[PDB]
Write a protein of this length. Structure first.
Length: 170
């Protein structure tokens, strides 16, 4: 465990902002205390500061399980988001896509969503905007990238790609 570098923080902040804009502060400023990010084996962990204030008291290994991994830094120093972050980011992601049964199955196996499977998408979603993919029952399935804008999604043919697969649960 250890604080992130100023340069690492920016990268992660920039990546997370692609899905929740400037709402990360919502995850850091929790009504039950401040939360922070500690690096460990190149993976970023979301954990409360109270728990961090108890290092040297815990074997660290136990400390890693007390936090939630959000993703990790690649060798090309980029931040790869992990689906374990989904439950924390989803409630704060402005741009969402709701997909049908067929698309859901294909998404859970790692594929992209096709027009025929698009049930609904948040208004004014730009092309390449980072989105959170939900099932028709409104449950989080993963992170995606809009292939076309919400406007262009209507005009496209059923076999066209409307959401690229980033990460999925399951």
């Amino acid at each position: 465990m250890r604080p992130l570098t100023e340069e690492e923080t920016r990268v992660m902040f920039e990546k997370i902002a692609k899905y929740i804009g400037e709402n990360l502060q919502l995850l850091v400023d929790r009504p039950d205390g401040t939360y922070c990010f500690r690096l460990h084996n190149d993976r970023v962990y979301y954990v409360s500061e109270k728990i961090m204030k108890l290092a040297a008291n815990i074997s660290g290994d136990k400390l890693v399980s007390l936090g939630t991994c959000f993703g990790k830094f690649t060798k090309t120093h980029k931040f790869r988001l992990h689906v374990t972050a989904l439950d924390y980011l989803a409630p704060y992601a402005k741009y969402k896509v709701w997909i049908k049964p067929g698309a859901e199955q294909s998404f859970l196996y790692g594929n992209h969503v096709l027009k025929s499977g698009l049930g609904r998408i948040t208004e004014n979603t730009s092309q390449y905007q980072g989105v959170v993919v939900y099932s028709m029952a409104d449950i989080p399935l993963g992170f995606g990238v809009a292939a076309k804008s919400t406007q262009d999604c209507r005009k496209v043919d059923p076999m066209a790609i409307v959401v690229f697969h980033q990460a999925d649960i399951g």
